[PDB]
Symmetry: D2
Amino acid sequence: KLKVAINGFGRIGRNFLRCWHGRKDSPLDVVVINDAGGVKQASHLLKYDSILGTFDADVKTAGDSAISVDGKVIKVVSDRNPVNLPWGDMGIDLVIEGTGVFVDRDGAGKHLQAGAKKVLITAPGKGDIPTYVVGVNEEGYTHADTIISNASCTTNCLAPFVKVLDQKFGIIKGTMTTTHSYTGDQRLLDASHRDLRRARAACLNIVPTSTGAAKAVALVLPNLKGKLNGIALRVPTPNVSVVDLVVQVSKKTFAEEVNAAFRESADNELKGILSVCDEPLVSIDFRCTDVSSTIDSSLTMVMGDDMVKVIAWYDNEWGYSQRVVDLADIVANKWQ
Amino acid sequence: KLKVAINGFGRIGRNFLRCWHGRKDSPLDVVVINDAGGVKQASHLLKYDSILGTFDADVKTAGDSAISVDGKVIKVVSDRNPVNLPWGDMGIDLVIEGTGVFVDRDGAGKHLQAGAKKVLITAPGKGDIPTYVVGVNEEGYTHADTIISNASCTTNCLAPFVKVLDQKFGIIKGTMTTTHSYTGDQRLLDASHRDLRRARAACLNIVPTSTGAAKAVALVLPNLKGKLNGIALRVPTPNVSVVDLVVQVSKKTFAEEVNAAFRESADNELKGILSVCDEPLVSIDFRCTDVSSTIDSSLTMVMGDDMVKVIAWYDNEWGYSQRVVDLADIVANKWQ
Amino acid sequence: KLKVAINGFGRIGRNFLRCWHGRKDSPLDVVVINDAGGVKQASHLLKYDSILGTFDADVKTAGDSAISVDGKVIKVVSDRNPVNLPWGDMGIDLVIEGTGVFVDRDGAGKHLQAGAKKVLITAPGKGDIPTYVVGVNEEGYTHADTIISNASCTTNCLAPFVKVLDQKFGIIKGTMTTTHSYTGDQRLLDASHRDLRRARAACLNIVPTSTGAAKAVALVLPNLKGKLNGIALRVPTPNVSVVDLVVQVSKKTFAEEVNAAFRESADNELKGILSVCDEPLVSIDFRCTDVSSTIDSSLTMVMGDDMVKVIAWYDNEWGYSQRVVDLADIVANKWQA
Amino acid sequence: KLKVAINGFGRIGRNFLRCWHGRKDSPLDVVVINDAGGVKQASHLLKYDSILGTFDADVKTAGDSAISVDGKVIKVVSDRNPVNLPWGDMGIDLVIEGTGVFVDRDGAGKHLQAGAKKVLITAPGKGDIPTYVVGVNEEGYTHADTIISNASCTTNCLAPFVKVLDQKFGIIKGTMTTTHSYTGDQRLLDASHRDLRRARAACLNIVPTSTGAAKAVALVLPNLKGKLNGIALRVPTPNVSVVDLVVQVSKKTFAEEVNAAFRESADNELKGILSVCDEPLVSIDFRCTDVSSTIDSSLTMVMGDDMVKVIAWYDNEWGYSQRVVDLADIVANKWQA
Ligand SMILES: NC(=O)C1=CN([C@@H]2O[C@H](COP(=O)(O)OP(=O)(O)OC[C@H]3O[C@@H](n4cnc5c(N)ncnc54)[C@H](OP(=O)(O)O)[C@@H]3O)[C@@H](O)[C@H]2O)C=CC1
Ligand SMILES: NC(=O)C1=CN([C@@H]2O[C@H](COP(=O)(O)OP(=O)(O)OC[C@H]3O[C@@H](n4cnc5c(N)ncnc54)[C@H](OP(=O)(O)O)[C@@H]3O)[C@@H](O)[C@H]2O)C=CC1
Ligand SMILES: NC(=O)C1=CN([C@@H]2O[C@H](COP(=O)(O)OP(=O)(O)OC[C@H]3O[C@@H](n4cnc5c(N)ncnc54)[C@H](OP(=O)(O)O)[C@@H]3O)[C@@H](O)[C@H]2O)C=CC1
Ligand SMILES: NC(=O)C1=CN([C@@H]2O[C@H](COP(=O)(O)OP(=O)(O)OC[C@H]3O[C@@H](n4cnc5c(N)ncnc54)[C@H](OP(=O)(O)O)[C@@H]3O)[C@@H](O)[C@H]2O)C=CC1
């Protein structure tokens, strides 16, 4: 019931399509896809995936202008410049901007120029762009918004439980470290990169790198402005990441009280977004989890009664993608 | 000038031998080695190493009771039970206990029974065993000690800079997380293990696990008793690890002041033990570093003036081994 | 029907249970497991798998003596010594031996001493033990065999299509190499091992190691006695392997014909055993394939009309386990004691 | 002596510089580098290497136009378009082309348009470009060749011992497979790529991919035209590869004899090019070996007296680079313009 266009059929673009496919009675209708790769490439890389495994659905080529998924057809275009896109011609209502290169208002606006009605950036938007994290501040959304951001994968894992920590105990200050799976932005072997660390062989190193999730939390949760900072450590795993948040709170507490606070939310206002796991699991066990963040309850610690340490897992590819579909769903429900 | 016996020719045992080999005018004399493996195995695995690379020295078999290194001969025995060892027969002064199974007083004492004069455990000693970290409290050592511990690799990285942080700013409370390279204690593929997490495929997961380094710091630095706790995250790298320490201090400070405090120590009382790196490096760049801990100066952060976050690198195998040689050197210099 | 006991709940042991669980109207009944690790461990590792993913079934501990899967309770014992197992007491018909330590008659025989009626080794048997490969020589099995072998994962991948090659082109001689994923027998980090190459860090090296798969093929395809040989190259992947076979055939041929020969068999004789893939895929795309061998068609080459090169993929864990289930199924159907 | 310019400071480009740096009394003088990434980047990546380790030399930036290694200053420029390079202005004699994008005459020719006197491609040339393999056909090079190719890392590993086999046993036909470490052309995570197999996550798969190494061997050893073929299997290791060759030889032989043949050549003809290792080693033990091919003796097999299987290791980065240095050395010694 809503014409959606996928701009950039990469990890997020493909995960998004498969996430959408699995939804029941979806308000969205993916009609077109744009990628620098060919049509035979789109179908091949959509059907076979080194992380999600083979797609359980009939995926084949539909000529040279489209692909087929369980019968349904989806147009396939290719144009590095968004302005030259048939968005208007097709009456595209929403464009899923997942190229990683059109994050500001100028770049992302080119979709609007091409005739698109609205755009959702699958990443933090630079400049003055409204960003939303489902379960944290999506209510602030309004159809009047033509360009919106769904933040980063890390921000979607952090915001949900930081919100609980702040409402229940009151965060004073804090730092975070995310031991993150490597991503396409890194190099397979030591090679040129503006970030001299991300330039190093990704499957061979623990790669420290900056993160904006810490400060970005303040966007969706104003009360946290200037209260958090952090860094990231990219490690040799292909997917699934973990956040290590340490905060000083105003109200004294203890490990199990903190955990119970998370469970209360997980069962109510954050059901489907936040989860608490009591099992002694490892990263691979969290692949394909729909929630944005899963607290490893047994790792929660409190030092000196007011320094809380929380460990939360998140499938950076799949989990975030479900959040993209959710935000897109909201756009379709609060339309015109 | 001191008969040393290597009990357990594993990662630490082999690294220790190669570390010792590189020392100039060493007070130590490695005369014997004991391992569950054969003689041809000891020489092969000593000469070829997937982490340290090929040993630059002539290593060959010396029959069925010894091996040869650059000409020098070293006896090779094999006996799972230490009591049945020719320590007394050879007049062994010090035994480098690196089997990982004789960590308490009963088990490690068996070396003394076999005729050994003293034992140095290359790991935290369980029970009432004096533990020392060079550069932190080695002065407390006395020849009267028959069984001593050199703590863990993590404790040797943490203690050095925690000592500086506490003397210069006064630690109130803190938590730590070590993103650690996998070790032999983990499983290559999901298999039986008392620790249900360490039981999972090590090259495929981020594996949370308990650590005693946090509490162990209190042994070598009494003032820290009950002030720190922490966890470990084993990741898919074969060697080199990193500590992420967050502490609340009494004296307000800022990132560069903290770094300068580390440099001051690195240049004086902690020269050779602690180091500060201003380069934007990654884990592989710290392999074979002799220091116990290297602060990544650009990652240092301070939140709200009294919450300090420090990131320090350490070669868990090689770096720790140099510390083993150092403690052994001390034992030889404060002998009888 | 058949009372089955699993001895050694490792990769194959757990892949076996899950393989069995997926079968419909199984003639087998897994009633007990001998896990050295314990009940909590058996339940946890069965539920969570780094390769197979989370078992889609309700798995929990049952008291301190068993576990349950979707309600079916399975007893759990722990004795490293087979002779002390309550096999006779429980009336165990078939013991699935997947410890990797009781691969010879004296070892496996211990299960018989404990009362089990028959033992099936999930690996090449050592010595005079009959070995079978489903799709190649299973018909040779008889209820009289007290100790059988299901061969290795490599033999199960090779034998099937080698059989097609031989009967269709006549194999004169040949050699093969398997680029194999690492396994529990290798070392995570450089450490003691009888095989000085397997002693080296598995996730960091290309590790050459001997293989009996080539010779083992003669045990199931007598016609190829002393005609094949080869080695293995253990590489840094957790599961799924690939065999590279180069044979000199009597009949001059060409790639397209060789592939066509495989397709015929795959569609008939070896349906469910051998497969042919025309897609340009990679190792991971073959995880959880039930067949024991999948020919990569586009890689088939023929040099000088008589030198054939074949590349076949195989899930050394899941595909092999499915075969162990099939062989056990034959033991049940051929039973009648 | 020879004014050398490095175009493309990638894995080979940097391995080259370090290889050159280790040489004594080199006839080459590296005076400029064209790095798209910049000066700080060229200096940093030259100093810190995830595979080679930290360069044991004082490496720093020099102003904003150059870098220096142990005091020797090397200019750095950045133009993705070769035609605009100051080659003529600097009087560059030889351009080391390691970008992987100017592998044909029209591409490499751009360096000549910019004033360089000669171009040496660190990869198979596309089209009518003469290609050489040090130890096999270097003597065929003449100063008249303006654009040459040093072939691929796989061709440099195969050719050398294939030459020994052919002249000592006569190769009738053959096929090979190289279990190759991944390279920058593969994708870190599933992503767009002309080669649908190379598009797949490199550290997570066994990736089959085509190779020209077999055919390329004919360019340096004419005698083997149309006699060999093969493929490549990219595996999860960062560096070092291994070639698996299976050939049918005219003269009946046996493993011990084949190995002995390699040792003779290694000790004479191909000393410093071919080597023979009797140790049971693994991939990592061959990092930084100067030879371009090391025969794993204990793995040599012969099936039916005429089917020979050879396994040879090679550091596709460092060994190849050392060869690029040698070929450049021949350009200098054979110069005289
Ligand atoms: N991976 C993850 O865990 C998450 C990523 N994100 C964000 O999503 C974005 C993309 O990331 P990710 O999918 O991971 O990375 P990928 O590189 O896998 O996806 C980016 C895609 O953009 C495509 N592309 C680039 N330019 C164009 C263009 N101009 N027109 C059409 N297609 C184009 C690229 O095609 P080609 O390959 O041909 O160059 C590539 O397929 C980034 O903003 C990232 O931060 C957010 C959450 C999670
Ligand atoms: N790796 C690292 O980063 C560090 C490890 N350590 C500590 O050092 C110890 C060993 O660790 P590590 O070297 O890493 O592990 P390894 O398993 O590589 O070394 C342990 C060795 O003990 C040998 N061994 C076991 N029992 C005996 C015995 N009874 N007699 C003779 N030899 C025996 C084992 O032989 P076999 O393999 O035949 O069973 C193995 O070679 C542990 O205490 C560990 O915590 C401390 C600092 C750093
Ligand atoms: N992995 C694969 O791809 C294939 C393996 N195989 C074969 O199957 C066998 C096992 O291999 P795999 O599962 O891979 O390896 P694992 O090591 O994962 O399994 C072996 C199991 O045997 C258990 N065990 C050892 N001794 C005993 C005992 N005495 N009593 C009870 N349990 C015991 C071990 O327990 P613990 O860990 O407590 O020591 C371990 O769980 C081998 O014969 C192997 O060659 C065949 C086909 C495929
Ligand atoms: N790696 C190995 O094992 C071997 C590789 N080779 C061959 O060498 C070549 C390069 O391979 P490799 O070093 O491995 O790969 P890399 O990608 O690491 O090196 C290629 C380099 O070319 C640079 N580059 C691209 N275009 C230009 C340009 N127009 N001007 C200046 N610099 C440019 C790239 O810069 P940037 O990253 O900024 O895009 C990159 O640094 C290929 O021909 C390859 O087949 C041969 C033997 C061995």
